[PDB]
Design a protein around this nucleic acid. Structure first.
Ligand SMILES: [Zn+2]
Lengths: 105, 64, 80, 91, 97, 97, 78, 103, 95
DNA sequence: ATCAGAATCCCGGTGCCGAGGCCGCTCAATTGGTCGTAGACAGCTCTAGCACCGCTTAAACGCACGTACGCGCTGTCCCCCGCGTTTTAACCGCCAAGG
């Protein structure tokens, strides 16, 4: 395997990330395992949240993910919601919060 | 009352000798080994007859 | 001028309903206008300051993104 | 000026392989990815300057991912990262 | 006719606006208010539309959060009618004075 | 004889707004913190200055959260605190989901 | 354990807060929220010390963990 | 020293050093640390000036940190600045909701 | 013996300027050192973001000015900008 | 109002201790000198921000009108304040098993 992405069996460009670290004014030198490690973490985070995205979009018989799907999938998670607490999505809205004092009883 | 005893045993991990402390709680039948150096901890059940050599023996078998 | 009064009561109603608010008092609307105004004051002050150092007389979406990240009210969606 | 679009397509085909996406959904996703990357990287730079270590290896990245994400996500991420380290180190 | 002593109107429109996706404040008057605030610190500034849309987005989100905590303040007040000092207490706790 | 209630409490509020000394004294707080950390890492020592830092931050944290909770109850047309008030204040700040 | 928190301690917390009249379940609720607070704090503090490869948590790491939760405290060299 | 040559009180070159070792940029200009040092100088001047007035209030000669927290909590813009800031031996505003005062 | 840092003597002199008849506690001097640390760190972080949202890596005083009036609130900020600008003139007018 | 009496404030007092002066070092600021490209600047080009209007229409405004939660009041009942009474979280000195 010529490319390090094929040498990692992953989907992200590592030397991209290493140049980002170099053109970051982050450290002075950057080792060889840290960019691979961080890119793998990124790839796991993408796949993990896109799981909840897939189920949340499948909730409404629509092949395409909309932003409302993403906000729903975040707020229906616990770890991602405490992750994204200061965070707002464009075209998001919020959850159905109908209080029990409101329904006609 | 709990018994806090120092021993002359060698820690199975950090290899510092005379640095393993044994805390034997007989009220709940729970013995505790502690390393004063690298800071590890091992727990094992004890009876009423046990002594620091009894749980340190159980720690040797728990590793192997 | 007076676009602060361009805020309409039915818009405040719609925001309360998506906000989930059932019952609306009458002494609310201008208070709402004042809070919205002070919010947007601090926002556009910081965005224009970011554009002041940009030496370009036009403010971008990216500018407003960076400025609201500075407030910690950080919003995604448009890149930045 | 590159976005991460086909990377998202390949992750998506690896997870829900019959799923489309809108444009602005991809935009919010790349916003998300950039935010996460910046937060971790800056926290790693804090690790360096709080620890006087003139470079950064993978161990710093592991402890920073611990510092940001909570438990279950953190442990699964540490697992995935070490597995990637393993397979890249083997070849 | 079917005048309907109330209850279905408000909650039904809550159901509609939470089925909803898009904005609520319409574009032009909000834009003109933005430019009036903008005409105060540096004169004569030009804008792209996506900035204004982001401003509108985050504005409505900010007010939605204010309304949510205000709503819970009212529910704790054993009332459904909101009050202004509800909003003042909410912003007191949010540290945004 | 007997004093009438509420008075001594406010008098010691005026007294306890003065000395910034630590309210929870040391040894039990230290035991609680030690019994907590142990759950994260066994055989862990603590720099005593760090213990004082934890103590300071914890006490100021709880005092401020009490202030917001107290103002919630004052808004709630009452004088006495409730646990639901703490839930309301925390729901505004966003600790719990 | 957690019951080392005395009732007049949380009362003194109300007093420096300036709170007059006290209910019942307040005490256990207080101990719970204090617990979760210290849980997150000391968790990432020990994470810092894990990276430190050392067997004592520094006061520095406590300070930096407070910064990481946006709870910046002066006074003790931070 | 450039600080004396700027007629100020904060050491320039220490700050110039710390800007280098902070990975703050790639290159560092000439007088940027002078400007930053003067900013620091006026900030601490204003803060400790109000602290001096706080000591004038209590008729104390040595500054206690309670003076510092009080002078932070009195002024508007300073308190909006240091909103997320607390200080050991801080305390709070001596403050009473008069609706809880008796009748 | 490793040599540690403080800013105590500097702000100490400044305190002696603005109040000759005034003492201070040691812990508060450490607090002020932490204060300078915090303000410096927020400024520098805004400077790095100034760099990356300007795609440049040189730092001049102009960036410091725009950083300060990004962070600090208005009136205080403008007074501080005035102090810094007059100091820039007095230094760079001479060597 | 109004007195008695708790509660607190506030004034010498002394003591002790750390803030501050002070003093002899040495290592980073300085001083000076030498490459170098980043950027301050000149200038080219085409986009897009702006302004304007005509047409469409759905959205706001005013009012008619009942009405029903908000609220002031009430009685009530209960359960925290507080002051009193033990009482138990912390450390200090002779026993009677070892050696
Ligand atoms: Zn060991």
């Amino acid at each position: 395997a010529k490319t390090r992405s094929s040498r990692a069996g992953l989907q992200f460009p590592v030397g991209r990330v290493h140049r980002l670290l170099r053109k970051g004014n982050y450290s002075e030198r950057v080792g060889a395992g840290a960019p691979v490690y961080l890119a793998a973490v990124l790839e796991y985070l993408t796949a993990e949240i896109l799981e909840l995205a897939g189920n949340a979009a499948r909730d409404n018989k629509k092949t395409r993910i909309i932003p409302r799907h993403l906000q729903l999938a975040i707020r229906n998670d616990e770890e991602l919601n405490k992750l994204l607490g200061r965070v707002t999505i464009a075209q998001g809205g919020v959850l159905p919060n109908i209080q029990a004092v409101l329904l006609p009883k | 009352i709990k018994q806090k005893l120092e021993t002359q045993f060698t820690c199975l991990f950090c290899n510092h000798d005379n640095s393993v402390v044994c805390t034997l709680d007989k009220k709940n039948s729970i013995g505790l080994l502690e390393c004063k150096k690298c800071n590890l901890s091992f727990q094992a059940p004890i009876n009423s007859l046990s002594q620091p050599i009894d749980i340190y023996s159980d720690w040797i078998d728990a590793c192997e | 001028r007076d676009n602060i009064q361009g805020i309409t009561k039915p818009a405040i109603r719609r925001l309360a309903r998506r906000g989930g608010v059932k019952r609306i008092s009458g002494l609310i609307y201008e208070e709402t206008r004042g809070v919205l105004k002070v919010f947007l004051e601090n926002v556009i002050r910081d965005a224009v300051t970011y554009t002041e150092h940009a030496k370009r007389k036009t403010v971008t979406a990216m500018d407003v993104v960076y400025a609201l990240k500075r407030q910690g009210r950080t919003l995604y969606g448009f890149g930045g | 000026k590159e976005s991460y679009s086909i990377y998202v397509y390949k992750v998506l085909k690896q997870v829900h392989p019959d799923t489309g996406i809108s444009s602005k959904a991809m935009g919010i996703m790349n916003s998300f990815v950039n935010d996460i990357f910046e937060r971790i990287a800056g926290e790693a730079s804090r690790l360096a300057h709080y620890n006087k270590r003139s470079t950064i290896t993978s161990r710093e990245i592991q402890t920073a991912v611990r510092l940001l994400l909570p438990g279950e996500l953190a442990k699964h991420a540490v697992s995935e990262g070490t597995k990637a380290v393993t397979k890249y180190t083997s070849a | 006719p079917h005048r309907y002593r109330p209850g279905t109107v408000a909650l039904r429109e809550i159901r509609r606006y939470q089925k909803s996706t898009e904005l609520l404040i319409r574009k032009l008057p909000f834009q003109r208010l933005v430019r009036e605030i903008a005409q105060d610190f540096k004169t004569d500034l030009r804008f792209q539309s996506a900035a204004i849309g982001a401003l509108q987005e985050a504005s409505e989100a900010y007010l939605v959060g204010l309304f949510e905590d205000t709503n819970l303040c009212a529910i704790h007040a054993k009332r459904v009618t909101i009050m202004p000092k509800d909003i003042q207490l909410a912003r007191r706790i949010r540290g945004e004075r």
